[PDB]
Every structure is written in structure tokens, then in C-alpha cells.
Amino acid sequence: RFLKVKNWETDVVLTDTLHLKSTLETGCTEHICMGSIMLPSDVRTKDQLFPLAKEFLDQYYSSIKRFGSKAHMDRLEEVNKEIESTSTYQLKDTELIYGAKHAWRNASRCVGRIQWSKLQVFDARDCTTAHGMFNYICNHVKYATNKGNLRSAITIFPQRTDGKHDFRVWNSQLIRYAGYKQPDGSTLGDPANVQFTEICIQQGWKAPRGRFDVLPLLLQANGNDPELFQIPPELVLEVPIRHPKFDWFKDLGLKWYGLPAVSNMLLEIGGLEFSACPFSGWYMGTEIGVRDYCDNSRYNILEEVAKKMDLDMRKTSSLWKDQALVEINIAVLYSFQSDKVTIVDHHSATESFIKHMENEYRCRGGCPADWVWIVPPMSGSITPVFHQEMLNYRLTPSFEYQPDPWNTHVW
Amino acid sequence: RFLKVKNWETDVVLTDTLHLKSTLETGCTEHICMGSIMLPVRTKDQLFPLAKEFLDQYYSSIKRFGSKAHMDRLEEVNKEIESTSTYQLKDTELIYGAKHAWRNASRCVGRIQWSKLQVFDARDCTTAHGMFNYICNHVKYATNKGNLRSAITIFPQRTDGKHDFRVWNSQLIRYAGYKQPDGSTLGDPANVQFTEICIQQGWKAPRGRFDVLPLLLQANGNDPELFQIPPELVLEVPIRHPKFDWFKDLGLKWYGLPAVSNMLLEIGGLEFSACPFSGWYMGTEIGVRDYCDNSRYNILEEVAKKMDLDMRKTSSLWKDQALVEINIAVLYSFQSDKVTIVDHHSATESFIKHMENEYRCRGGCPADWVWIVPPMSGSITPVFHQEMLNYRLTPSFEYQPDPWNTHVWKG
């Protein structure tokens, strides 16, 4: 009930008590572990909402050292009145900022949480239309990009009411490249976005059918039909990918965007649901060089790079895939660093997370963490997180997945 | 009930029913996942149901469930338990049990081979000298001049827990480690404590960097005795690199036979506390973990020095570069000396084929993603993208405490 995690490289042992405050469920049971399942796990009635609000307000007033105070009881009373009356309630700006920052703090799959307290929160709860959503998102993108000196930010659109008036960003990330199925048979651009790219065409977009076409935004306000907008190209910071040794690398024609900005998640704070809450930070190099560039279901460039390196691709035991993989990831970090765009390598990011874990255990009693997601997709065991035992559990406020809107939209 | 796992690279979905036959617990609950935790005395009371369940499985596999042979064996075992408080496995049952303990080992990526295991019955052994002879014959059989063959040797089962057979070595072949007064370590830092025990027990240590440890063998609960494996039985591979001629001058070698000797084999409620088993290496076990863990031989720095990589910032990925070159050298050396080894690309591809086959013929395949995914180049192997279900089936291999912590010394 009071659990210990060991680091097997350093023998440092930490005691976790924070998990006892966990609320939601993991998908595991004592008979089966679902730790490697990507996605384990609907209006909220008047009755479930007030306990959720209480739990959150309890932790908020604790965090400002006003638990059991004047202002604490009054606020509890006031939200209790507002739920009984209005069947919902509205967060104070202070509570919203706290709730967003703690949703990031609680994201057990995120290695970048040492930065959790330095999040810029843009309150977009006064937004009513898709053009207004576009305006808020352009401002976010410009603020977060900051001429390459990236700054973490989240923009929070109005909360779900009765599930019929949902705000949704249909894109999975604010900035992604299009994908097209060729008549010749294969796929041009990003295969992961083929379905979404179609819904852009099959709803209005005129695609330039290229390999790195920044997709338009598909924005849904108040449950209406979504609308297309092009992000101003001057707001989309991109980085051409070259290698500090291989001059032929530029001829591969690779580039990537500077801003990782997740837009399809749901932010839960005190029982309230924010279905449109795009948030952004900066990349860890392996997200681009390992996953985006070298997954077989993505841009899948390993063979081409290895050929240009003239590696022995006859046998897997030559480790030609591994050699190319390293070089590709050297180039990504080199390109971003050269163009002065913020990026972190996996050695620095995971060392930071270990320091963050130790901070959280010391000052908070724990840190929920998903080892399957925290360990980088290359060189796992030479990063310190590989040797770190981690306990995974679900705290709120939280970011949660939600269905893709095209499968849900009453059109 | 049914459970589905998805491969996110291929979209292949599999359906697990085998998890319904799981009895033992995992460590997880609905509120916490313990999937990255390294480590998450028996009476007649509990023994006959464990025996019956094993014998039901055994006779089902031989298409004789409910037969007179099956019923007679259940009767015979029942009377043997109530009369002697234990029972003896037939040779056929022991072989089945050892093969299925391997088949059920959710952390083992090499299970495609599970049905080709050579089982050596050493249940007639009575002294540490007899154990030594059995272990020598195992090492010679399994080594097979470099054409490695999987094998297991099974010493007498536990009775009252005061007469255990134990191999005090964690592996049959391992290099000594010596703590120097200046704080540095010579040899394998992981084996320092065991090396000190051997020295205390009378071993004259050569005090080199690659000294094969003596066997420390405990029969029938007696004090352990020291034995030296004949050097002609210990196959070793000098490590060189196919392009870098300076790599040989690092003075590295490794042994050919990975032979785990500290686990407990549970079959039908019987506990075999001494059951060394061996296969052949996957390259990364040596090149990534043994050589490159900070807590092990830790050769990244000197290798990266001789490669003259930019070692000033981690974002040069000099650690990742050297790591690949070391792992090329391990595979090249083993193949050149015609010693069996498998690279992590081949091994993970075979595991996926094994897993799919097990889902079809058996209804599932328990697998521990955290251990199955290799410690370098994770996401360019197919297991990274494979959802897996972890649950505990018997027969099984289990951990047990190091015997020097529990042994009652006779003197």
C-alpha cells in the first residue's frame, strides 16, 4: 500500500504514496497486465459532478495552503450552489490554470514533465465560432513558436455542455503533413494522415498533392460542421534536414516542422470536460528521426538512407538499419540546432525526467509514469529511464483520448 | 470472455482466451500498473489441486484426457501425496513440464524454440560432486563446439525447504568482479558480491578482467562446495570489429553459452530449486547490456574515444554511435567463430511469428513488452508495435532469493 520503486543502475529507492490518491482505473487486474495496450478504457449527470468538483477544489485550496479556510468553504459552497442550479459550473481563471498545469503534471506517458509548471494557458472559453477558433490557434502557434525559441502553451476552448455542442479540433496535431494514396499503388507524404487528408479534400480542400504539404485546420465550434482554414505559412516554422557529415543527405528532400502541438485530446478538470484543448511544447529528437522518419507505416526512409550510405543490406545482422537510424537522428538534432529551433535529445530528456521524478517523489510523494512510453524508441538501455522502475496510475486533472470526430459527428 | 491485442504497424488483431487459464497474480490492480517492476514452505493442503491441474494439462496435450491412464495417474498421485506429503513426476511429465515452463516464460523472446529443449533428468543426484558432473555434461552438450543446443538439467525437488539443491552461481558461466581499494572495479561489476563469496570459500582468484568464476554447488541443503569448470568446456569468443582493427586491442571477449542457474522451476506444485537452463545469445544481451550498461563493463567511453566521435555534447549521439559499432562487433565475432548467436532483428521477427502461431493454436501467448523489446533500436523491431498481454501460467520459472541470504551454515 506504500510502494517502492528501485533504479537498478543507481540503487536509488523511492517510496510512492501518491498512488493512493489515484481515482480512475488502469485496465490491469491482478490476473492480467495491460501495460502495453495503447488504448485501454456520455453526458455527466448532476450527481457525479459535485464529488469531482469537490476533489479538485480540495486539492487546489491545499496547493495554495488554504485548505479548510474561509475562501475554501465559500468556493465549495458556491460551486455546490451552481451545480445544483445550472447543472454544471465554471472554473475561476486561477483554477483553470492550475488544472491545466496539473493535467500535464499527471500525464504518465510524458517524458517532458520537468517543465510542467511553466505552461502558458490561453483562456479561449469566450470563443463561439470556427473563425474565432482559428484566430485563437494562430495566436497560440505564433506564441509557442517564438521564432524558434519554443514556449509551452495550451489553448482551452469552451467545455462540453450536453455533448451536442462540442468544440473539436479535427486535426490530431495542429501541424502535420498530408498523405495521399497513389494510383501507382504506394503512398505519397505521411501515410498516417491519409484518412484525414481525404476528409479535407472530401470537404473542400484543394490539395497540392505533395510530400510535405502542411494540412489545413478543420475546426468545429459549438457542435456545428467543421470548417477549413490554412495556417499562415509564415507561422509554420519548418526545418530542412541535413547531416553534418553526409552532403547527400539534403538530396533526400526531408524537412519537418518545429512545433509539436497535440489537438485531439480531452482535458478533464474537476469533472468538467474540455474537448478542444490544443497544447504544444518542443520535440524530442527521436519523435521525428525514429518514429516519423523510420516507422514502416510512416515515411519509412531507412532503406533509402542505408543505400546512400552503401551499407551491407543483405543480412540483418550487419545492423545496417541501426547504423542508418543513428545517422538520421544525428541529422535531425543537427538541423534543428543549426536553425536555432528548440529540440532535446533523448539522453538529455530522460536525464531530466529522472531528476523530475526525484523532485516529485520528494515534494509530492510520487510520479505516475508509463515505462512503455517513457523509454525512447532507440538506445533504450543507455538512457537512465530504462533502469528506473515506474508505477503507472491515473490522477486527475488529466488528458484523455476521445473518438475521432468524424465517427461521432451528427452531420 | 475474450481479449484483443493489436499490432499498430500491421493492424493485425489477435484474440486471447488463454488468459482465462491464468491462476497466479501479476502485481497490478485496477488502480496501479506494476508492469515495469523488476521483481513483483508448502503443505499437502494445496498440493493435490496443483498436481491435478498439471496432470489434466498433461493428459490433454497427449490426447488422453479422462482416459484410464489419466484417472489411474491422478489416483496414484493422490495416494502418494497423502502418504508421503509429496509426489514424483514421471520422466514424460518432467519433460512436458520443463518445456511448458519455457513456453510460459512471458519475458523470453526466444520462445519460438520452446519445443526443442533437451531435458536432463538429474533427480538421482545426491552430492555437490554429482551436481558438478551433471553440469559439466550439460555444458558440453549444449555448447556442441559452437553449434549451441538448448538444454535444462533438473536436480531433485524441494522437500522441506531445509534440504534444497541450489546452484549459487546466477549463471553457469560468468566473469569475476573485484572491487579495488581505489573504488574502481576489475572485471564484471555485477559479480562482485558472488566473487567475494567464492574467494571466502577458498577460490584462488587470478584477478583479471575476464576470469571464469568457479561453480558453487549446494546439494541436499549442505554447505556449498567449489568446483572449477574445465577450461576446455568453456567456449569463448574474442571480440573484434569487421572494419575497425583497433577494436581487438580493447581486449574484449565473451563466453558462448548463456546458462541461467538461479531460477526455480515449478511443475504441478513441485519446486525444482536447481534447474540450470541454457540456449544461445541474442547479440544485444552482450553488446548493449553486458558491455555498455554504466553498471557493467561500461566501454562506451573508450570505444567512442577510439572512434574519435564528438564526445562533448550528448546531442552528437556519440553514445548511440559507439553502441551500434560494439553490437556489430559482437555479432561479427560470434558468426566468424561459428558460435550460435541471433541478432535482435531476427529474434523479434521470429517472436512475432511465434506469438501469432500461439494465439491460433493455443488461444494466447503471455508476453512482457518491457522485457521483449530489445534494449537498442526498439521501434525498428516489430515487437515494439505489438500489443501484448502479460499473465502467469504454470508450469513456470520463478525467481527465488539468493541462497547466501537464506542458507543455514553447517560449518
Ligand code: HEM
Ligand atoms: C515541452 C517539451 C515536451 C516534451 C519534450 C514532451 C515529450 C513527450 C513525448 C516524447 C511523448 C511521447 C509521445 C509519443 O511518443 O508520441 C509525450 C507524450 C505526452 N505529452 Fe509531453 N512533451 C512536452 C510537452 C508537453 C506539454 C506542454 C503537454 C501538455 C500541456 C504534454 C502532454 C503530453 C501527453 C498528455 C502525452 C501522452 C499522450 C498520450 O497518452 O498519447 N507534453 N510527451
Ligand code: HEM
Ligand atoms: C534459445 C535461445 C534463447 C534466446 C535467444 C533467449 C533470449 C532471452 C532474452 C534476450 C531474455 C531477456 C533476459 C535479459 O535481458 O537478461 C530471456 C529471458 C528468459 N528466458 Fe529466454 N532465451 C533463449 C532460451 C531460453 C531457454 C532454453 C529457456 C528455459 C528453458 C529460457 C527461459 C527464459 C526465462 C525464464 C526468461 C525470463 C528471465 C527473467 O524473468 O529474469 N530461455 N530470454
Ligand SMILES: CNCC#Cc1cc(F)c(F)c(CCc2cc(C)cc(N)n2)c1
Ligand atoms: C497514434 N500514435 C500514438 C500517439 C500519440 C500521441 C498522443 C498524444 F496525445 C501526444 F501528446 C503525443 C506526444 C506528441 C508531443 C506533444 C507535445 C506537446 C510535445 C512533444 N514533444 N510531443 C503522442
Ligand SMILES: CNCC#Cc1cc(F)c(F)c(CCc2cc(C)cc(N)n2)c1
Ligand atoms: C536484474 N536483472 C535480473 C535478471 C535476469 C535474468 C534472469 C533470468 F532468469 C534469465 F534467464 C535471463 C536471461 C539470460 C538468457 C538465458 C537464456 C537461456 C538464453 C539467453 N539468450 N539469455 C536474465
Ligand SMILES: C[C@H](O)[C@H](O)[C@H]1CNc2nc(N)[nH]c(=O)c2N1
Ligand atoms: C504496442 C505499444 O504499446 C506501442 O507501440 C507503443 C509503445 N511505446 C510507445 N512509446 C511512445 N513514446 N510512443 C508510442 O507511440 C508508443 N507506442
Ligand SMILES: C[C@H](O)[C@H](O)[C@H]1CNc2nc(N)[nH]c(=O)c2N1
Ligand atoms: C526497471 C525495468 O523493469 C528494468 O530495467 C528492466 C527493463 N527491461 C528489461 N528487459 C530485459 N530484456 N532485460 C532486463 O534486464 C530489463 N530490465
Ligand SMILES: [Zn+2]
Ligand atoms: Zn499492469
